[PDB]
Design a protein around this ligand. Structure first.
Ligand code: HEM
Ligand code: HEM
Ligand code: HEM
Ligand code: HEM
Lengths: 146, 142, 142, 146
């Protein structure tokens, strides 16, 4: 997907301030809390019985760190997301059979987490640029369904 | 199902929104128009630029409708009946667009209520806006 | 909103389905598994090949649940309450999958009821299955 | 999208029997009837007040003929749907701003119409092949959103 220079500026400036050890776990945890059917794919993570159990689950935090790494890898390759995500697409599509609507949901949860952390700094034009990013990642992750 | 705890969470978050409700509704509309530009085609007679008095005035209407839903949370189909007729029969709003505005409302709340937007409250608000959206699209195929 | 005419259309189409209901439910499941292979992961203990007695037996269960909904069309949340608990709490069925099975049920009806699958009746059946799907996913976020 | 030889066989064999002057109008008409918000894009077509008015509307029938032509053009180019639909994507996405979920809905309505017309011949494996076709067309028509 194509971001304008102003969009790339808004995205990269915010992302350099992201805590990459935490924000991924926050987004994955909120996905499991807000859209509970996604817990189907994480039975091995243990205690997911309450929001507090999910958010403080160390496996959720560690796996969320991997997820955010992939978003970061996408940000470095905005003009070529399909090649970047080919391996993750085969995993999530061919092996896991995650419905691709959930890629969109997780991207939107991450947007909510960025809005929570950054407040007024997460302006509507900054959000619009991030929506293009998370849509491009979700489409790339779904490419093996297409 | 809006649980008792959901209703408590939603009332409390809306209570903290306070008299910013209308400003927040306007911000959510602006986020939707910039993030999901397909939605702008429903408002050709609106100027949708930043600071537009029409978007500000409409955001207040949106917020008042949401506040009516909060105040009648156990009876939202009846509370929102006239609004669901408008959006389905007259405006022909695509159901997919209610998910878009709901997300932008969540983003707006998260950007303004850092203490209140816990995961539990995020979930509750999400269910509330999905329930509102279900009523507002119910005159299509519900 | 299921209108009076919708309920009439759905009762009449289901009446014409007659005692093929269970066979048709099994066919709709097979169409879903072949057309949308992600859905097969909910049935790892099923053999999903053509002619499978497990798919046949389950199609009968699906049809009986739909028939219960037809018979209690004005009270579907209560009629389907136990089934919605199962699909949301125990099975964790992704809501997107109910649209997939609903489509395959429509396809099955269309392939078997050439006189009855008018556009009006197609619309009515679509609303009915969307209403059933709304109840069955309502223990998530409704 | 890639159809297997067996899938291509199932699709092309059925399609040669399709009445191309009627099936497109049936699918467009049912879309307008079953998903009434789509009538927003067809105000100039006149009487859409009842199912009978929609199905017998001569503009619905004529426009549906154009739609089916595009599906036919897709069938001749299954291994390259993006180039085939580039012009239609710019129309439906950049100019009309049709939400791409409706491309999926129309594809599914067309599947229902084929099932209605062909009956038992529209077997579950034949349907599965057509679902891959209509998904590929919908994705190609949406490519300008990606
Ligand atoms: C933008 C969306 C997503 C991104 C970027 C993403 C990224 C990743 C990454 C980087 C891994 C680690 C793979 C490895 O260890 O080599 C992973 C694993 C996994 N993902 Fe995701 N993911 C996304 C969406 C989802 C969703 C929505 C679900 C389920 C609802 C899901 C289910 C899983 C599972 C179950 C694994 C573990 C696979 C295994 O270790 O066997 N993913 N994902
Ligand atoms: C939370 C969801 C929503 C709420 C609470 C809501 C509420 C309202 C209210 C209260 C009005 C004014 C009613 C009146 O003046 O009588 C209105 C009008 C309108 N709404 Fe919404 N709405 C929602 C979703 C949407 C969406 C998603 C769209 C389109 C993308 C939309 C498009 C419109 C339009 C075009 C008007 C008419 C504006 C005008 O012509 O002045 N609404 N809405
Ligand atoms: C019209 C929509 C649906 C209806 C009426 C329906 C109905 C039913 C019924 C009656 C049962 C058996 C209940 C019992 O034995 O106590 C059942 C079980 C089940 N359903 Fe559905 N269902 C629907 C949609 C779906 C979808 C979309 C999926 C997944 C893609 C699904 C997955 C399952 C599974 C995995 C079981 C358990 C099978 C087993 O372990 O034996 N259902 N459903
Ligand atoms: C698979 C999905 C679709 C296909 C293959 C398709 C194909 C076509 C074709 C071939 C035309 C004629 C363009 C021309 O005259 O050069 C057209 C026009 C049009 N389509 Fe579609 N379409 C699809 C989905 C939709 C949907 C879902 C909507 C609205 C809900 C829509 C709205 C329109 C409109 C309004 C026009 C008229 C444009 C004009 O003449 O200015 N299309 N489409």
């Amino acid at each position: 997907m194509h971001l304008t220079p102003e969009e790339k500026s808004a995205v990269t400036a915010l992302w350099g301030k992201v805590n990459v050890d935490e924000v991924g776990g926050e987004a994955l945890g909120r996905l499991l809390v807000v859209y509970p059917w996604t817990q189907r794919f994480f039975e091995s993570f243990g205690d997911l019985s309450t929001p507090d159990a999910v958010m403080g689950n160390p496996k959720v935090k560690a796996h969320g760190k991997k997820v955010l790494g992939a978003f970061s890898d996408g940000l470095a390759h905005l003009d070529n997301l399909d090649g970047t995500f080919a391996t993750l697409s085969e995993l999530h599509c061919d092996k896991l059979h995650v419905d691709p609507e959930n890629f969109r949901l997780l991207g939107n949860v991450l947007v909510c987490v960025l809005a929570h952390h950054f407040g007024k700094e997460f302006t509507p034009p900054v959000q619009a640029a991030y929506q293009k990013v998370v849509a491009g990642v979700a489409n790339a992750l779904a490419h093996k369904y297409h | 199902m809006l649980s008792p705890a959901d209703k408590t969470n939603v009332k409390a978050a809306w209570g903290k929104v306070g008299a910013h409700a209308g400003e927040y509704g306007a911000e959510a509309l602006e986020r939707m128009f910039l993030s999901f530009p397909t939605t702008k085609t429903y408002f050709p007679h609106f100027d949708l630029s930043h600071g537009s008095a029409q978007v500000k005035g409409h955001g207040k209407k949106v917020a008042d409708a949401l506040t009516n839903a909060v105040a009648h949370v156990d009876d939202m189909p009846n509370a929102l009946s006239a609004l669901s007729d408008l959006h389905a029969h007259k405006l022909r709003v695509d159901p997919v667009n209610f998910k878009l505005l709901s997300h932008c409302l969540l983003v707006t709340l998260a950007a303004h209520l850092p203490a209140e937007f816990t995961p539990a409250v995020h979930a509750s608000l999400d269910k509330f806006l999905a329930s509102v959206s279900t009523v507002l699209t119910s005159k299509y195929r519900g």
